[PDB]
A paper describes a structure:
VLRs are featured with a LRR domain of multiple LRR modules and an invariant stalk region rich in threonine and proline residues2. Jawless vertebrate AIS employs VLRs as antigen receptors to recognize invaded pathogens, such as viruses and bacteria. In summary, we identified [name] from [name] as an analog of variable lymphocyte receptor VLRC using bioinformatics analysis and structural comparison combined with in vitro bacterial binding assays. This is the first characterized VLR-like protein in amphioxus, suggesting the emergence of VLR-based AIS in basal chordates.
We applied both the recombinant [name] and Bf289081 to crystallization trials; however, only the crystal structure of [name] was successfully determined at a resolution of 1.79 Å in the space group P212121. Each asymmetric unit contains two molecules with a total buried interface area of 567 Å2, which is not sufficient to maintain a stable dimer. In fact, gel-filtration chromatography also indicated that [name] exists as a monomer in solution. The overall structure of [name] (residues Cys21–Asp202) adopts a crescent-shaped solenoid conformation, rich of conserved leucine and isoleucine residues involved in formation of the hydrophobic core, which is typical for the LRR family. The structure contains a 36-residue LRRNT, an 18-residue LRR1, two 24-residue LRRVs (LRRV1 and LRRVe), a 20-residue CP and a 51-residue LRRCT. The inner concave surface of [name] is formed by a β-sheet made up of six β-strands (β1, β2, β3, β5, β7 and β8), with β1 anti-parallel to the remaining β-strands that are arranged in a parallel fashion. Notably, the 20-residue CP in [name] folds into an α-helix that shares no identity with the 13-residue CP of previously identified VLRs. Moreover, the N- and C-terminal caps of [name] also have four strictly conserved disulfide bonds presumably important for the structural integrity: two within LRRNT (Cys21-Cys27, Cys25-Cys39) and the other two within LRRCT (Cys146-Cys171, Cys148-Cys192). Altogether, lamprey VLRA and VLRB possess an insertion in LRRCT, whereas [name] and lamprey VLRC possess a protruding loop in LRRNT, suggesting that [name] is more likely a putative VLRC rather than either VLRA or VLRB. Thus, we identified that the residues Asp105 and Asp107 at the concave are key to recognition of Gram-positive bacteria.
Author numbering: 21 to 194
The structure:
């Protein structure tokens, strides 16, 4: 168990790794392979990389709410086939890639279960890189929650809900 965390096994035999509110600037090393719930809420994390969850393929819940995350590698979740919930709410993300969620979505579908992504309260940049999520939300996706999903930029779209903006308003210049 990492020194900044508490690792406890539940009555159901599931290991919770609780590292909330510890001032962490990075994901801790040596989280045990048996980790099922990883709580990293209320820290100072800025980046999720391709290797942030290396060796943590049993994770069912990841709580990264209320950090300072401004980028997540599109490869970060590519081996997380048991993920039920990921919380990236209250961070500094301006975009997320569609490819980021492919594996947990596919795995959840194959396993007959729900995989939920909670992205509330990020400063979304509503250019052509976020049209995909805008449209999934507009369509009624069961994967991506639509609470507090609003554009920070560009100026014309500031304050508008992603799911209420037409596709042709999501524009990229050079």
């Amino acid at each position: 168990c990492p020194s900044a965390c508490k690792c406890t096994v539940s009555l159901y035999g599931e290991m919770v790794v609780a590292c909330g509110g510890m001032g962490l600037t990075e994901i801790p090393e040596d989280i045990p392979h048996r980790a099922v719930y990883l709580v990293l809420k209320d820290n100072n994390i800025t980046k999720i990389t391709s290797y942030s969850f290396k060796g943590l393929r049993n994770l069912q819940g990841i709580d990264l709410s209320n950090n300072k995350i401004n980028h997540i590698s599109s490869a970060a979740l590519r081996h997380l086939g048991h993920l039920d919930d990921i919380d990236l709410s209250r961070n500094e993300l301006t975009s997320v890639s569609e490819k980021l969620f492919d594996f947990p979505i596919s795995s959840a579908k194959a396993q007959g279960r729900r995989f939920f992504v909670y992205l509330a309260n990020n400063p979304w940049g509503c250019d052509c890189r976020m049209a995909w999520l805008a449209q999934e939300l507009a369509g009624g996706s069961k994967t991506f929650g639509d609470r507090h999903m609003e554009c920070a930029t560009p100026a014309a779209l500031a304050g508008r809900g992603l799911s209420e903006i037409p596709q042709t308003s999501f524009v990229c210049t050079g």
